[PDB]
Amino acid sequence: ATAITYVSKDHYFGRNFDYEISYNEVVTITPRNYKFSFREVGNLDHHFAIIGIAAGIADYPLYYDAINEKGLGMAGLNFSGYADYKKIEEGKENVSPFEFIPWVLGQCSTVDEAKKLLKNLNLVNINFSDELPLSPLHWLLADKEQSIVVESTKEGLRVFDNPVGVLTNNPTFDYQLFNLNNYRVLSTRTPKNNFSDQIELDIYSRGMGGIGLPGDLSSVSRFVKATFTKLNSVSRSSEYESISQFFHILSSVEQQKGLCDVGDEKYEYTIYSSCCNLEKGIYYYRTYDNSQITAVDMNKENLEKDSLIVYPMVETQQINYAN
Amino acid sequence: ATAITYVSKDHYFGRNFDYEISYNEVVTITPRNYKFSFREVGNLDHHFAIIGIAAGIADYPLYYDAINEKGLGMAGLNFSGYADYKKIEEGKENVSPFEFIPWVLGQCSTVDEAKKLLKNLNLVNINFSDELPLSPLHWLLADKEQSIVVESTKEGLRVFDNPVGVLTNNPTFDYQLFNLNNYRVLSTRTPKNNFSDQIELDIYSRGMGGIGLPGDLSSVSRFVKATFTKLNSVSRSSEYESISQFFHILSSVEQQKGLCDVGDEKYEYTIYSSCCNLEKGIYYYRTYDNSQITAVDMNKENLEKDSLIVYPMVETQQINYAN
Amino acid sequence: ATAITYVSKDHYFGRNFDYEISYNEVVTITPRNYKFSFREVGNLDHHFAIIGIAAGIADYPLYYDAINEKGLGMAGLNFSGYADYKKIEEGKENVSPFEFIPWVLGQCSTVDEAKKLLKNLNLVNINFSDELPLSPLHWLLADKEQSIVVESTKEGLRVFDNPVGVLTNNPTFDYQLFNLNNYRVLSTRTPKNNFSDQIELDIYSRGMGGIGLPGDLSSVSRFVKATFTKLNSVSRSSEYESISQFFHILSSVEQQKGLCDVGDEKYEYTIYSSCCNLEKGIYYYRTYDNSQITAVDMNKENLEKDSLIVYPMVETQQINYAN
Amino acid sequence: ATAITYVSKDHYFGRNFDYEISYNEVVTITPRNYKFSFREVGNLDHHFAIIGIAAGIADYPLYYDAINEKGLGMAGLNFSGYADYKKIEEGKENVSPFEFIPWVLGQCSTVDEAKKLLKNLNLVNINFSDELPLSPLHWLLADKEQSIVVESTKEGLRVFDNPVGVLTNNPTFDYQLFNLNNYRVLSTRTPKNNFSDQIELDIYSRGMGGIGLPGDLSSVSRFVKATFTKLNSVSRSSEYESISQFFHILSSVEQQKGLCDVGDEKYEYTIYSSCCNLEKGIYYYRTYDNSQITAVDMNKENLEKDSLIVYPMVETQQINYAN
């Protein structure tokens, strides 16, 4: 996975969902009066409305990523081997990873509010159901001002400020940021010939500034290439142009089918790519085999409802036969 | 600035068009009886029908790339500083670069027939007009059996068999192919720990087999990355799944706006991407700010016509509002 | 700097000393009855004899690296920006970095003994003298069984087991080890063509397995290249052949003059390279402008002495005119 | 397997000899009146005196590299799979590779005189003997003014001006030079943060300007690394300081035993390194297991002699026991 923030005029939030198998992903709107029952903390009978992509395998909104009606977003990204979920700790707010998105997004408007919430958190090892055990995750949260990373590992729970608004998979966030230091020299412009003033070296291609940028599908490579691509991105401020640029940043680090064998000839690939407009409450997506962007606008629903509002994803190619 | 071939069940041909300015690109169908008048060779009054993208700045089809009704495709790619066009040579077929796609695709059904034609070619330095002078180019041609590269440089005219079905920009094709030798180790599978059997190295990420693949936007890096991506691609044989994979290979080496500064704060970016089904005569495309695939089927036109059939490109984002 | 361990039959320990200026380095033997007066801990009036390289600028042995007569070695390596020395802490053994080598090597025979010693350590910010303030360091310690790294940073004091027997400069040791994970694929043997079974790639050179090994002079690059070079090293077990291999591992990551500008046209370069035989008590060195190995054997001195025994370094080239 | 030129005040020429087996390498001085009998060209009964390293397996001087008394040097380097030696061609000077160093150095004082000679050359496939068949090679020649490369391949005989004064193994020299273009950015100074002005990247190490330089033992990587090292070298003008720097450039790309497995657990390693002072006629060398520099001065022999003057190499470690 790769999650990013972007700002044009509005602020956007989204991610590539990379995996080798697809669990009936759906677009789910959780309206305000859908009661959240939590295993070990107080219930939220009334809360902020949420829209995101969820696993359509349960009668409860099992979000992979989502935004709320106040412009706060959250995404869980694979952290296999690194994530560590705890036993119940008296005096903490004991929240399972499966509940975590609803817990934050239901009651926080801003990253600053979530930071307050997160001081008393303990992420506990409680499965949604017996058939649907917990996945090892870490999290990106963002709003119109900033982003944070939440990692629960063997060492404990850490919350990081995220200066680049990017996240991928392993290893821990401190290492990802540090590694950026190695790529200081990368540029959008052609370099001078620093190698020697005694010889002429030819500028035989455009794009030479970026030489050294990693193009493989591993976690750290993708972090570096998505961060470069995001921070050097230019687009106009119109909504369609801004989401176009955003999906181009996500494309830059998508996983093509065939390229990442995870064993037994199964392939990790970019099942879907999302872009959420935090001001407008619009969840945009593309899927591996549907290039057209599809938009679901949470504000078009009745957010006073008490039941999930579920949209199947348009997963097959929508061609414009012009002619 | 990347052209490729791909085979699933049907065979496909297409390209990214990367440049810093967009000159009224249109989809042009040249029907069979549109007379081709050539500056220094015999005219083609009747010829094979052609579909491609052309510069919509002239009343002659100035193709950037195209396919004909017999399943032969051809594309011109920037080769600045490398291309050399010649004086007229008595005893050669003297064809200008602006005429070259009509010349080959009007009369050849296969790459083998083009190879016969190319033995007598001399690419000549004659402009379409003073207002529209020649661009430095090289070409990829491909059919359902194979692909070749055509380069006219200071050293002369060379035609290469293309064992990977990819082409980018500079330098010459022999160097591009040679450079692939440096990447033998790259894999879709996790490597063994060859580094040392005396220590344990952790597999902390998927996709580690690709470490080393270059992710910058320069010519040679994109060549390597598109080749690796193409050759290791997997998809089902259905038309929509096949073209989806094709566009994903082109996306792997597209150029995002902002990342390649060419001066005067102008940026080289991927203005459009095409995929052509050689068996079906369908030209599919996506543009920088329209992610939906748009299809133009040459076979829906009257190919016995006399005049060019010109379609504007769908350039703004075609969004599926699903609620 | 780069410090390493190596084993053939005997166990060796040594380092490159890389800096931009040379402080009258000398080979100093500290015999058993040279009283060590410590600023804040108990004195060592009698202790193990030590041989190493020291700054010949003071009447006290200011070791850059040394071994003792029991086969325990220690080296300090630049850690600028990372090292943090503390205030005096009641209940700790408060030892200044300038005293640290004498403190450990004077009283420990083995790394296990030093680990015991190090549990109560606090490295304190006390200068040797007013003219000779403390340098930011971290440390490698080794004996015939194992090696450890000692880092005192803002976070605190950490002692790491060192599975590869290498150290360089920044950043912290955990990051260096982690980074090795990225180089799992590197090999002494030619790789298979994993890139594609559809094309022939030519083995045009020997040594292709190692492609990806970094060759720059930065700290992390040197760590990776010295670790690869050490762990894949082969030599015979004879003393001269074993030290030859050891100096070849150090050469692999030396800093040539001119290549590392540190500002004002001053250059960080490998002032000297050492190799110490832990069993025999022999300190071998080469300097930048003397390629011949020079050997100082501590066991040839009277180790019951009470005064430093000081050898100037042979710093100019010793040529054998044969023829 | 790396040859270089270097200038301080005097001019120097020399090489690493990298191979997996050592065949009685000796230092051979060919005096002026040692008759050269050539297989297919006129004999040189009187010629310039030559000093170099030769295979001590024949009563003819089979040089790996050498210089003559007029300050012209020449070296043959492995070019396996690339070299092509020819049938005898009437009207050419037909010279076998085993004769080629005598042929040029016996009669030419300068690279310009060699260029005149080489216009009529045809390198012929004639073995010294059945027991000692030809090796595939290419050559670097150099004097106090310039250097050139000579390659005989399937395509023919080519002579290139060498703008960097380096040569390694495969592939052809035009590709080696071209590849340098990819390294324009590399610097001896710390880079600016070009990556993004929106974030702070820490300069955690010296030598970050070189990041990207390749550190593996393959041909092309060593070419790049030796070129960067050579061109950015600094030293004083004194003979001992100059040769010290020279040997440091060769050390930057030497091959440590164990790191290049060529099969049958045989290893390609740097058997010897030479540096020749062209003005003085001195051959200096180091060997894998002798780090001390050994000098052989051709001018101390009687150059009017008739017979080869042969010195065994000092191959075991010459240690300075300083106590």
B220 vs D171: CB contact, 8 Å cut-off? Answer: no
Partners of residue C293 in chain D, C-beta under 8 Å: 291-292, 317-320
Determine, for residues D180 and A195 on separate chains, whether the beta-carbon distance falls below 8 Å: yes
Q: Quote the tokens at residue A9.
A: 């005029």
- Residue written as token pair 């300083």: D322
The DSSP line for C12-79 is: EEEEEEEESS---EEEEEE-TTS-B--SSS--BSS---EEEEEETTSSS--EEEEEETTS-EEEEEE-
What is the C-alpha radius of gyration for chain B, rounded to an integer number of angstroms?
A: 20
Using a CB–CB cutoff of 8 Å, tell me whether A181 touches chain D.
yes
C-alpha to C-alpha distance for A103 and A41, rounded to whole angstroms: 9
The amino acid at residue C289 is D
Q: Are A182 and A201 in contact (CB under 8 A)?
A: no
Work out the number of other CB atoms within 10 angstroms of the CB of residue C155. Answer: 9
Does C206 touch chain B if contact means CB atoms closer than 8 Å? no
End-to-end CA distance of chain B: 38
Q: Residue B136, preceding bond cis, omega within 30 degrees?
A: no
Query: Taking CA A203 as the corner, what is the angle to CA A206 and CA A253, rounded to the nearest 5 degrees?
Result: 35
Residues in CB range of D289: below 8 A, 6 or more apart: C240, C241, C244, D315, D316, D317
Of A218, A245, A311, the CB nearest to B211: A218
Closest alpha carbon within chain C to B192: C185
CB distance B3 to B222 below 8 Å: no
Header resolution in angstroms: 1.5
Task: Count Cβ atoms within 10 A of the Cβ of residue A84 and give its class: 0-12 exposed, 13-18 middle, 19 or more buried.
Answer: middle
Please give the Cα distance from A14 to A5 (Å, whole number).
Answer: 7
Rounded Cα–Cα distance for residues C31 and C50 (Å): 7
CB distance D175–B175 less than 8 Å? yes
C291 touches chain B (CB under 8 A): no
Nearest Cα residue in chain A from B219: A205
Task: State the Cα–Cα distance between residues C270 and B104, nearest whole angstrom.
Answer: 63
Termini Cα distance of chain D: 38
Residue C168 to residue C220: CA distance in whole angstroms: 7
B109, exposed or middle or buried, with CB in 10 Å at 0-12, 13-18, 19+?
A: middle
- Report the distance separating Cα B227 and Cα B221, nearest Å: 10
Query: In sequence order, which residues have a C-beta less than 8 Å from that of residue A87 and are 6 or more positions away?
Result: A124, A125
Chain A's closest residue to D177, CA to CA, is A201
Of D211, D284, D286, D224, the closest CA to residue D252 belongs to D224
Give dist(CA C106, CA C35) in Å, integer.
10
Query: Does residue A175 sit at the C interface (CB-CB below 8 Å)?
Result: yes
| Residue A127 backbone class (left: φ over 0; alpha: ψ -120 to 50; beta: rest) | beta
DSSP assignment of B32-83, as one string?
A: TTSPBP-SSS--BSS---EEEEEETTSSS--EEEEEETTS-EEEEEE-TTT-
Give C171's contacts in chain A (Cβ within 8 Å).
Answer: 178
Tell me the two tokens of residue C123.
């490295």
Cis peptide before C133 (omega within 30 of 0): no
CB contact under 8 A, D182 and A211: yes
User: HEC states along chain D?
Assistant: CEEEEEECCCEEEEEEEEECCCCCEEEEEECCCCCECCCCCCCECCCCCEEEEEECCCCCCCEEEEEECCCCEEEEEECCCCCCCECCCCCCEEECHHHHHHHHHHHCCCHHHHHHHHCCEEEECCCCCCCCCCCCEEEEEECCCCEEEEEEECCEEEEEECCCCEECCCCCHHHHHHHHHHHCCCCCCCCCCCCCCCCCCCCCCCCHHHCCCECCCCHHHHHHHHHHHHHCCCCCCCHHHHHHHHHHHHHHCCCCCCCCEEECCEECEEEEEEEEECCCCEEEEEECCEEEEEEEEHHHCCCCCCCCEEEECCCCCCCEECC
C292 close to D318: Cβ distance less than 8 angstroms:
yes
Q: Quick one: residue A40, left, alpha or beta (phi over 0 = left, psi -120 to 50 = alpha)? A: alpha
Rounded to 10°, the helix B97-107/B111-118 angle is 130
- Say how far apart CA C310 and CA B304 lie, in whole Å: 100
Compute the distance between CA of residue A162 and CA of residue A177 in angstroms, rounded to an integer.
9
Closest CA to A54 of A34, A40, A39: A34
Kind and range of the H or E run holding A262 = strand A261-263
Q: Looking at domain B1-313, what is its CATH homologous superfamily?
A: Penicillin V Acylase; Chain A (3.60.60.10)
Q: What are the two backbone dihedrals, phi and then psi, of residue A278, each rounded to the nearest 5 degrees?
A: -70, -40
CB A43 within 8 A of CB A314: no
Residue A164 token pair = 């680049």
**C-alpha to C-alpha distance for C200 and A216, rounded to whole angstroms:** 22
The one-letter amino acid at C42: G
DSSP letter, residue A97: H
Q: How far apart are CA B191 and CA A172, in angstroms?
A: 22
Tell the residue number behind the tokens 């994979």, with chain if given: B245
Helix A97-107 to helix A111-118 angle (10° resolution) is 130
Residue D265, sorted as left (phi over 0), alpha (psi -120 to 50) or beta, turns out to be left
Identify the closest residue of chain A to D185 by CA–CA distance. Answer: A194
Which DSSP symbol is given to C86? B
Q: How far apart are CA C64 and CA C77, in angstroms?
A: 8
Q: Hey, are the CB atoms on A171 and C178 less than 8 Å from each other?
A: yes
Q: Which two tokens stand for residue B106?
A: 């009007």
Residues 83-142 of A with CB under 8 A from B: none
Omega before residue B102 within 30° of 0, cis: no
Is the link from the previous residue into A171 a cis peptide, with omega within 30 of 0?
yes
A 10 A CB-CB count for B59 gives 8
CA geometry: angle A192, A198, A201, nearest 5 deg: 45
Q: Give the residue from A123, A19, A31 showing the smallest Cα distance to A68.
A: A31
CA–CA dist D180, B207 (Å, integer): 29
Task: Choose among D58, D55, D68: nearest CA to D29.
Answer: D68
Residue D142, beta-bridge partner list? D73, D147
Interface contact B316, partner A, CB < 8 A: yes
From CA A142, how far away is CA A144, in angstroms rounded?
Answer: 7
Q: For residue C155, what are the contacts with CB-CB under 8 A and spacing of at least 6?
A: none
Which residues contact residue A220 at a Cβ distance below 8 angstroms, ignoring those fewer than 6 apart? A168, A171, A176, A179, A214, B205, C182
Sign of the C-alpha dihedral, residues C322, D3, D7, D10? Answer: positive
B209 interaction partners in chain C (CB closer than 8 Å): 185, 194
Residues 6+ apart with CB under 8 A from B7: none
CB contacts, 8 Å: B171 with chain D: 178
The rounded distance, in Å, linking the Cα atoms of C82 and A120 is 31
**Which residues lie below 8 Å from residue C22, measured CB to CB, with a gap of 6+?**
C271
Between CA C9 and CA C224 the distance in angstroms is 25
Q: What sign does the dihedral B178-B184-B187-B191 (CA atoms) show?
A: negative
Chains contacting C with at least 3 CB pairs below 8 Å? A, B, D
Listed residue (A209, A247, A191) closest to A12, CA to CA: A247
3-state secondary structure B196-242: CCCCCCCCCCCCHHHCCCECCCCHHHHHHHHHHHHHCCCCCCCHHHH
- Indicate the residue type of C306: D
Chain D residue nearest residue B219, CA to CA = D182
Whose CA is closest to A68, among A40, A34, A91, A96?
A34
Left (φ > 0), alpha (ψ -120 to 50) or beta: where does D263 sit?
left
Nearest CA among B71, B253, B67 for reference residue B168: B253
Mutate to test the interface with C, among A182, A259, A260 (most CBs of C within 10 A): A182
What is d(CA D13, CA D74) in angstroms, rounded to the nearest whole number? 8
In angstroms, the CA A108 to CA A69 distance is 10
Q: Which chains touch A (3 or more CB pairs under 8 A)?
A: B, C, D
- Across the interface, do D175 and B178 touch by the CB < 8 Å criterion? yes
Cβ–Cβ pairs < 8 A, chains A and D: 87
Answer whether B177's CB lies under 8 Å from B184's CB: no
- Under 8 Å between Cβ of C251 and D250: no
- For C212: left if phi > 0, alpha if psi spans -120 to 50, otherwise beta; the answer is left
Give me the phi and psi of B317, to 5 degrees please. Answer: -70, 125
Torsion of CA D211, D215, D221, D227, to 10 degrees: 70
Pairing of strands C320-321, D290-297: parallel
For residue C305, what are the CA distances in angstroms to B107, C43, C188, C308, D319? 99, 17, 49, 8, 27
Across the A:B interface, residue pairs with CB atoms under 8 Å apart total 243
Catalogue the long-range contacts made by A115-118 (C-beta closer than 8 Å, 24 or more residues apart).
A115/A148, A115/A159, A117/A93, A118/A150, A118/A157, A118/A159
CB-count exposure of residue A42 (10 Å: 0-12, 13-18, 19+):
exposed
Return the DSSP state at A48: -
Instruction: Report the greatest alpha carbon distance in chain D.
Output: 74
Tokens of B302: 């009257």
| Half-sphere exposure in the Cβ direction for B165 (13 Å, CA) | 25
**CA pseudo-torsion sign A283, A284, A286, A290:** positive
Taking each continuous run of H as one helix and of E as one strand, the counts in chain B are 5, 19
Are B47 and B254 contacting, i.e. CB atoms less than 8 angstroms apart?
A: no
Of B185, B196, B208, the CB nearest to C231: B196
* Cβ-defined contact of B231 to C199 (cutoff 8 Å): yes
**Among A1, A285, A230, residue whose Cα is nearest residue B291:** A285
Kindly provide the b/e burial profile for residues D31-48, where b requires at least 16 CB atoms within 10 angstroms of the residue's own CB: bbebebebeebeebeebb
Query: In degrees, to the nearest 5, what angle opens at C-alpha D288 toward C-alphas D286 and D289?
Result: 95
Pairing of strands A166-167, C266-267: unpaired
Cβ–Cβ gap C189/B194 under 8 Å? yes
Query: Is-contact A192 A182, C-beta < 8 A?
Result: no
- Which residues in chain B touch residue C195, judged by CB atoms under 8 angstroms apart? 180, 183-187, 228, 231
Element (H, E) at C272: strand C269-277
D146 is written with which tokens? 């310039």
Which residues does residue A25 pair with via DSSP β-bridges, in sequence order?
A55
Select from A182, A194, A228 the Cβ nearest to the Cβ of D187: A194
- Identify the experimental approach: X-ray
Q: How many residues does chain C have?
A: 323
Burial code (b: 16+ CB inside 10 Å, e: under 16) for B217-249 equals bbbbbbbbbbbbbbbbbebeeebbbbbbbbbbb
Residues facing B295 on adjacent strands: A321, B284
Contacts of B130 by beta carbon, 8 Å cutoff, 6+ apart: none
Instruction: Check A180 against D195: CB less than 8 A apart.
Output: yes
- Identify the burial level of D193 via C-beta atoms within 10 angstroms of its C-beta, where 0-12 means exposed, 13-18 middle and 19 or more buried: buried
Chain breaks in chain D (C to N over 2.5 A) after: none
Does A214 reach chain C within 8 Å, measured CB to CB? no
Q: What secondary structure letter does DSSP report for A183?
A: G
Beta bridge partner(s), residue D86: D124
Query: Which residue in the set B220, B261, B319 is minimally distant from A188, CB to CB?
Result: B261
Find which of C170, C178, C222 to mutate to test the A interface (most A CBs within 10 Å of its CB): C178
CA distance B223 to chain D (A): 14
C-alpha radius of gyration, chain A, whole number: 20
CA A14 centroid distance within chain = 5
Give the one of C194, C198, C199 whose C-beta lies nearest to B185's C-beta: C194
The count of other CB atoms within 10 Å of the CB of residue C109 is 15
Structure tokens at D24: 């009685």
Q: Are A207 and B268 in contact (CB under 8 A)?
A: yes
Say if CB D293 and CB C319 are below 8 A apart. Answer: yes
